[PDB]
Design a protein around this ligand. Structure first.
Ligand SMILES: CC(C)C[C@H](N)C(=O)O
Ligand SMILES: [Cl-]
Length: 424
């Protein structure tokens, strides 16, 4: 029985991974993870049900591959081994990340390897990162670093954030993922080039499944799948901008505790994820109860006087009352959408009418229909929204011009902060 036959006959792809939202994570709206979503599509490619396990550190993640009847593979942001170990093989690389030395902003800035001398440095035991340090320890015998079997990447970055350690080494993708929680963490320099992540399979000369893993990854590159997962999980800095990423991290820690309770009480009955609600909060005013603009909206959820009036808001500037009116208002809109629009697409169309309004959203829906697209599918109608700002297109709508691009930004961002709060 080949490695490939066995999975096909067992009806199940056994995959091992780390506990982390980079890799695999369990929440209310189901499971998520770069690696999970990817290995999930691989089990789908083969006709099989995926089953996820977790190791407690990386020596034990690699161990399980040697166990009898253990995991088919490890999908875990692993980057291949620089030396020779017969007990493990690696797929083609599926993502270019750069190891980077991480420091606390405003502290002494290391700029070359020498500078890592005489610093408290922590790293994961069994990591490629650990191994890049040993190699430099040959060059620099005075180098000290701690190898830890207990902590994960998120813990290493926390430590640098608040100064229990000076430095760590981590791949740039997970740094960017984590930049929205640790406002003081910064990239000291690049300690190498964009070596790639690969999945690990037990050692051997059987390739039945390895060729398929490699065929799947080459297909995934062909269709943009890795690029899309990269943006969802690892593109916070890329998408939100550096300044947006760390300030968000500041606001998570300094502003959200003041309102979280209210976000949660509104969620409870409205059966609406409070974290979705807070995300609207964050996009609307960066969790600033007292915020006003020059365009007719005040408060935490940026309400008009007429909405505040209809939702029974006494004081648009009171955090609780703004959240309540603004949360009630999202659900009123969600509820007014045609019956034909289904979750989860429903919630995303509701985010968009929340920014642009029902009339205009209807026109982009109608526009999707005329173009042969599905007006009940969000990815379909999101392609039309921008067009509401285009001459040839708005002049054909009942309600004309609208800032559809702003509206697409509004939903992408809220969906990203939603992810972020889910990933805390
Ligand atoms: C820090 C580790 C969890 C990840 C690293 N790419 C490795 O393969 O060792
Ligand atoms: Cl979107």
């Amino acid at each position: 029985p080949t490695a490939l036959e066995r999975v096909q006959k067992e009806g199940v792809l056994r995959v091992i991974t780390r506990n982390s939202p980079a890799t695999y994570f369990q929440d209310r709206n189901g499971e998520t993870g770069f690696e999970y979503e990817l290995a999930k599509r691989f089990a789908e490619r083969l006709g099989v049900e995926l089953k996820i396990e977790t190791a407690d550190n990386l020596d034990d993640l690699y161990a399980q591959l040697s166990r009898e009847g253990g995991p088919a593979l490890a999908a875990a942001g692993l980057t291949p081994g620089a030396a020779a170990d017969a007990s493990v093989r690696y797929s083609h690389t599926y993502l270019d990340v750069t190891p980077q030395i991480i420091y606390r902003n405003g502290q002494q800035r290391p700029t070359r390897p020498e500078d890592l001398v005489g610093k408290r440095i922590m790293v994961l035991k069994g990591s490629s990162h650990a191994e890049q340090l040993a190699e430099l320890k040959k060059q620099y015998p005075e180098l000290k670093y701690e190898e830890s079997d207990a902590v994960e990447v998120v813990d290493l970055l926390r430590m640098v954030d608040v100064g229990d350690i000076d430095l760590t080494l981590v791949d740039s993708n997970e740094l960017a993922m984590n930049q929205v929680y640790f406002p003081n963490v910064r990239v000291a320099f690049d300690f190498g080039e964009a070596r790639g992540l690969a999945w690990a399979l037990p050692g051997g000369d059987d390739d039945s499944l390895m060729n398929e893993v490699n065929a799947f990854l080459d297909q995934a590159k062909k269709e943009g799948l890795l690029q899309r997962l990269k943006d969802r999980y690892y593109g916070h800095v890329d998408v939100l901008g550096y300044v947006g990423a760390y300030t968000f991290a500041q606001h998570l820690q300094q502003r959200l505790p003041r309102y979280e309770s209210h976000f949660k009480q509104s969620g409870k009955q409205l059966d609406t994820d409070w974290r979705l609600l807070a995300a609207i909060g964050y996009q609307e005013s960066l969790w600033q109860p007292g915020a006003t603009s020059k365009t007719g909206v005040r408060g935490l959820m940026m309400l008009t006087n007429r909405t505040a009036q209809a939702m029974g808001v006494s004081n648009r500037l009171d955090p609780k009352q703004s959240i309540q009116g603004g949360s009630k208002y999202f659900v009123q809109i969600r509820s007014e959408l045609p019956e034909s629009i289904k979750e989860p697409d429903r919630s995303w169309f509701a985010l968009a009418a929340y920014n642009i309004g029902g009339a205009h959203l209807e026109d982009a829906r109608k526009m999707a229909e005329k173009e042969g697209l599905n007006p009940n599918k969000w990815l379909d109608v999101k392609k039309m929204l921008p067009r509401l700002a285009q001459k040839q297109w708005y002049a054909k709508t009942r309600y004309g011009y609208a800032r559809g691009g702003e509206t697409v930004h509004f939903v992408q961002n809220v969906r990203r902060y939603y992810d972020i709060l889910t990933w805390v």
